[PDB]
Every structure is written in C-alpha cells, then in structure tokens.
Amino acid sequence: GSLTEDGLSYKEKFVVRSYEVGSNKTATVETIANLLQEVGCNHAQSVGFSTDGFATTTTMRKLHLIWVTARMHIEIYKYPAWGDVVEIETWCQSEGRIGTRRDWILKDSVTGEVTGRATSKWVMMNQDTRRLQKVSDDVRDEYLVFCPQEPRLAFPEENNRSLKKIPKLEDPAQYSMIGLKPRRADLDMNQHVNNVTYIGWVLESIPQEIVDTHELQVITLDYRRECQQDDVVDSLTTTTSDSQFLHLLRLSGDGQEINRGTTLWRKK
Template identity: 90%
Template sequence: MLKVSCNVTDQIHVLSQCRFLPPSAPLFSSFRRRNAATLCASLTRPPVVAALVSDKGEPCVQSGSGSLADRLRLGTLVEDGLSYKEKFIVRCYEVGINKTATVETIANLLQEVGCNHAQGVGFSTDGFATTPTMRKLHLIWVTARMHIEIYKYPAWGDVVEIETWCQGEGRIGTRRDWILKDYATGQVIGRATSKWVMMNQDTRRLQKVSDDVRDEYLVHCPRDLRLAFPEENNSSLKKIPKLEDPGHYSRLGLMPRRADLDMNQHVNNVTYIGWVLEVSILVPISLEFLKYYTGQE
C-alpha cells in the first residue's frame, strides 16, 4: 500500500502535476499508478464557476468548463456570484531576504485576484475590469486611493487565499475590498481596500460613471455594504492630509522604466509602492494617487 503524507502546498503541486500528465506516460509502476490515480481523484477541484446575469437582471452562478486559464486557476466565484476567492502559493521570487512575501508581492496578488474576478463575470478582456460600454468609449479604471494592512506576512511556500468584491462608490468611482487568509489555518493575515475612478484613455481626464456602466457592474456587487475593514467610518479610505514640502522621507530623480508601465500605458500602482519602500519601511500603507505617469513626462 502506498501511503502519501503532504501539506496544503504539496497537494496543490501534486494536483497540477496530475493534470499535465499524458495518459500514455507510465507512473512508477502499475501498482503505484492505481494509488496515484486515487490521490489525484481525491484532490480534483470543483468545476469552473461563472457568473451570469439572468433575464430578470439578477446574478446567477453556472458551472462549466471555462477557458484553459480558468481550469488551471485556483479560484472561483462564491455561490452567490458576488465575490471571488483564489488561492496562491508564495513563490521564491516573491519573497525578500527574510523569506516572507514583500508588500509589492501582496499588492500584485490583490491586483491579480481583482482582474481574475472581473474576468469571471465577463469583463476585462482587454483592460483592468473594463465593461463593454467602457471599452466602447475608451474608458479605464485607475486607482485613486488604496489602503493595505498586513498582520502576518506569508512565507515562501505558504498558500494564501484572497477574497475580493467590488461596490459602487458614488458617481465618481467604485470600491474594491480584499481579505487575505492563511489557507492552512483560516487566519486572517491582511485586509485591503481601494477606490477606483474612471478615466478616458485618450484624453487622460477623469469622467463620471454613467448609468450604463453602473448597471453593468453593480449587478455583480453585494447589495448591502460590505467592508474589509469592519468599521464603516474607519480612516482606511479617508483623504490623506497634504504633506509638508519637503516631506520627511523623499527621493528625487525617479524615472519610470518601460517595465513599470502596465496595459493601461501608465505606471502601475504597485510600482509606486516599490518607490515608497525604497525610502521607508511600512506595515500599514495608504496611498493617494494624484497624478499618473506614462514614462514620457
């Protein structure tokens, strides 16, 4: 009898290997093949879940095969289709000198799970969570403000589960929240919230969210206010006081590189976090984006 002992990370690795194994490839021996097949069967993920809008304008969840990326991704919409969860393994290139994930890694994962959520409900085919109306009018979402708090940094090889959802934020934008958990223990290790505004990609001017756009994305948002940070009146998204000039920490001469630009053709918000961390080490971090750079300024 073949006995296998593994942790959560090992299970995810084994699952991915089982999926890529050609049917004709021998697996150790005929005896071991039967046991390995049993192991893979026990780790099989639930079917891909997609969010659709019913004829009544209400969200519904439907199982299906999805794209290849959907089948390999360790994420899915929750049962009501109004939030999305995904699991990530912390890779060796995502940790710092202390073998724990960096703030930039966390911010990149937040952005990734947000984009995957948007793809799961049919958006973001050629931009960050853009709806059909937005793509038609050359409109994009840009980060106006972000607040991240990490209570425990995941280490190399840890599995992190991130849940995200979005909500309306007045007429000028939308809000996206995240909760991060250690998948092995279920412990909340971080929270984040952000405010996004709509910008015309051609003129680079902010634009109010139209009723058409609101109707397209609000159907996938929770009906009741749901906050990653429990207190409704907390300071997580309040305007940051104007800094004195010069600031206590500063660095001059920064020039955006080509690699700093994202698909919206401006410096990605995660890059700004990296610049900040070059002059200061932070645990909670709040950012307010006053101007976006395209690398040509």
C-alpha cells in the first residue's frame, strides 16, 4: 500500500483468501472489518503514529492517552469473491473537540466500481482510568497536517444511517446466543478483545435462516464498554421490520451493556 499523491489518504489492495469467505464463497463482514483495520494501521505507520490500533502521538503516550472506537458503520453493496482483488482507500478528519473520524471506500480493483463504504468515530480516553476527554489544540494540530482541510465524507447524504441514534433493546429479546467468550485468537497485541470480535458476537444471535436467505447490507455498532479477556457475553436480537434488527451485547452475569447496534439485510 501507499499514501496517495497529496499525502492526505492511503490506499491498499488485498486478495480475498480461502479461509476469509462464507457459504456464498464471498468475504464475510468480519473479513471486511479486519481489512479496514489493517489499512488504518498501515496509514498510521506511514505518517509516524503508533501501530497498536490506537494511532497515538508521543505526547499522548506520555499522558497515557489512547484513541478508542465509539461507533463503526459499514455498508456493503457487493462482497468480494475468493481470489478477487479489493482496493481500499482510507482517510481521517478531526471532528472538533469531540474526537476524530476515520472513513473508508472499498472498490473492485478490476472494474473500479465502489463496492462498499465505512465510517468510524473515535474518542480520546486515558488508558488506566478509562475516563474520556476532549481533544486539546496541541494534539489536534499534530493530526491536522495529515487530514484533508475541506470536508471529505464517505457518507455525505443529510440524515444518513451512520449518524442515527440507536435505542436499547427491551427484554425479552426475540433471539439470543448466550455464554460467548473470547479465545486468544480474538485478542490484539495488547491482550484486548479486537473490535471485529464484537461484530461477530452481534451476528451470532441472527437466525441461520436469515443468514442463508439474506445478505447483510448495513451494520451500525456503538461500543460502550470493553469485554475483558475473562468476561462472558450474551448477544440479543429483535426484528424491528428488507429485514432490520436491533442488537444488544451485555455481560452474562450482571447484564452490563457493552454494545448496541442495528443491521439491515436484503433478500438474496
């Protein structure tokens, strides 16, 4: 991969692998989410930020500050098949004192057609106390020289799906998958649960008949709290409708919320 001509975005190509595809012989949404993370990491390395998933500066590191995902929104028009080459372009933008945004555009390398798009909201947090904080001028100016100055949005449309408020699922849930636990393959280099595992956990409570007859078109996920390595999760889903679902991940014992989200599925 490489930074583009103006140095304000990064592109990379990936060939879809045999173990990365589902029953349709096309990439799963978790494979897509892993590729989004990989290209984000390579963009951070290319300009000198940390390469641990937190994309921090030396100033943030001394203060024990990190960037954490608050929301992920992905829309796929066509999932790439096994052996296909997908090109992904990514860029970031500061969103004032609130935090930052990372956007992505996925294209079929052969046709040049846009096959997907994604956006994510990130907030600054002290890694020890877990307390959020606004972004100061000093940290903001370190990032601004690597971002487009004029707004560039993967989801420009007014009142689009990426910015909608997600309600809390009410008990009883229509469907559930209980007792979900991470294994070492679900952890990152810092022993934290990888963000993509939560997408997988949300999808576990979708009935297999839906997965067999529909394709996932849109997923919006809010991240409220981390699942620790020794935590156990319950995945809950209720149909709200194309088929739409409301989702909730919570700790198996006390019922503490870790994530909430929505999915939109199209009949095959």
